[PDB]
Design an enzyme around this catalytic site. Structure first.
Site, mmCIF file in Angstrom:
data_model
loop_
_atom_site.group_PDB
_atom_site.id
_atom_site.type_symbol
_atom_site.label_atom_id
_atom_site.label_comp_id
_atom_site.label_asym_id
_atom_site.label_seq_id
_atom_site.Cartn_x
_atom_site.Cartn_y
_atom_site.Cartn_z
ATOM 1 N N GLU A 166 34.382 36.735 47.845
ATOM 2 C CA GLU A 166 34.688 38.165 47.962
ATOM 3 C C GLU A 166 34.429 38.746 49.357
ATOM 4 O O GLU A 166 33.821 39.798 49.468
ATOM 5 C CB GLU A 166 33.944 38.996 46.861
ATOM 6 C CG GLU A 166 34.335 38.489 45.479
ATOM 7 C CD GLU A 166 33.944 39.336 44.280
ATOM 8 O OE1 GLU A 166 32.867 39.963 44.325
ATOM 9 O OE2 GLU A 166 34.656 39.300 43.256
ATOM 10 N N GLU A 272 38.720 35.523 39.450
ATOM 11 C CA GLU A 272 37.644 36.095 38.641
ATOM 12 C C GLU A 272 38.199 37.290 37.929
ATOM 13 O O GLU A 272 39.005 38.059 38.491
ATOM 14 C CB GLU A 272 36.480 36.657 39.482
ATOM 15 C CG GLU A 272 35.616 35.687 40.259
ATOM 16 C CD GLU A 272 34.438 36.412 40.903
ATOM 17 O OE1 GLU A 272 34.012 37.474 40.389
ATOM 18 O OE2 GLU A 272 33.903 35.885 41.900
#
Length: 345
Positions: A166, A272
């Site tokens: 991320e 995700e």
């Protein structure tokens, strides 16, 4: 054993859509049997991809036999290749080779868990936003990449090397992460010519809607980053409950990423996702939207996160965990894999 063909993945010579999961904790287990049984459960569930943390950064070495992979300090940083260091990642890789699981291994965290860019900022100064252009931090991060990648270059269990979990550069020009990802993916490619490489971003910044996740305020431009030569596929994540958008934004979020991947000629991976409530209905709707785009840019999805029962007891429930054997796993794992197997060929 893990390649790209147009906008699809090819695993064990089969071209198509693959389901997988995330387990940040599996690479840090010290009990070999707990690694094996978790991978046996994932493999018996028909999941082919497992995303794990290949980083474990500390500023101070932990006490006892606690696992750590790298200690970061202004001078004298050290990478742990000992039994409680990268040998734990070695065991995961070997166990995945045996059990037919392909690993996505992220190499630093944007978040503070397991050190992250924060642990590098503590050692090397600056801010999280300057981490990408901090020479001492990037020098040590590349040394760490070399230490990990060099161990598994010849493993058929690597699905992809992932630059970071991320990565964001809040308020930064989107060229910061673009230039950084170009130079780091070119570096990884020099160490490993054949395995896939991906960014690991949430997929923020792209056309489609005017809501927060589509904005360029987190330093990423999904479309721009898909142009990077040594990134083989797009990654995006999906957490509407954290992003101020309804769950109904999900299908469009998936569609909009798949359209960008299609235009770039690369596969998209929904890497995700999770929602805390009415989980089966909400997440099954998203899995359907993803499967429907299997010939139009999407080629897999990984829910966050796997849950299991180890020698140390039940694994952590962060509100997104889906436990093996549970009714929620029947909804989001068994039924999903059966629907994937029914997709037209």
């Amino acid at each position: 054993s893990a390649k790209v063909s147009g906008t699809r993945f090819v695993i064990d010579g089969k071209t198509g859509y693959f389901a997988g999961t995330n387990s940040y904790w599996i690479g840090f287990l010290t009990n070999n049997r707990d690694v094996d049984t978790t991978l046996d459960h994932i493999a018996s569930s028909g999941l082919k991809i497992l995303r794990v943390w290949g980083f474990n950064d500390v500023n101070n070495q932990p006490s006892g036999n606690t696992v750590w992979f790298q200690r970061l300090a202004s001078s004298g940083s050290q990478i742990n290749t000992g039994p409680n260091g990268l040998q734990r990642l070695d065991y995961l890789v070997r166990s995945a080779e045996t059990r037919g699981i392909k690993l996505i291994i992220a190499l630093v965290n944007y978040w503070d868990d397991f050190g992250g860019m924060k642990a590098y900022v503590n050692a090397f100064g600056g801010t999280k936003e300057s981490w990408y252009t901090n020479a001492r931090a990037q020098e040590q991060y590349k040394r760490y990449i070399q230490a990990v990648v060099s161990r598994y270059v010849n493993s058929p269990a690597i699905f992809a090397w992932e630059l970071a979990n991320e990565p964001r550069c809040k308020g930064c020009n989107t060229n910061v992460i673009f230039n950084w990802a170009t130079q780091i993916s070119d570096y990884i490619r020099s160490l490993d010519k054949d395995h896939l490489i991906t960014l690991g971003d949430e997929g923020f910044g792209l056309p489609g809607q005017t809501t927060y996740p589509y904005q360029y305020g987190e330093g990423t431009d999904f479309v721009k980053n898909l142009q990077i030569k040594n990134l083989d596929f797009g990654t995006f994540h999906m957490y509407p409950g954290h992003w101020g958008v309804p769950t109904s934004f999900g299908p469009g979020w998936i569609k909009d990423h798949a359209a960008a991947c299609r235009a770039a000629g690369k596969p998209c991976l929904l890497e995700e996702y999770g929602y805390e409530s009415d989980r089966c209905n909400v997440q099954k709707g998203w899995q359907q939207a993803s499967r429907e785009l299997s010939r139009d840019g999407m080629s897999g999805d990984l829910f966050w996160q796997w849950g299991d029962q180890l020698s140390t007891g039940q694994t952590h429930n962060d509100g997104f965990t889906i436990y093996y054997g549970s009714s929620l796993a029947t909804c989001l794992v068994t039924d999903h894999v059966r629907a994937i197997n029914a997709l037209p060929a």
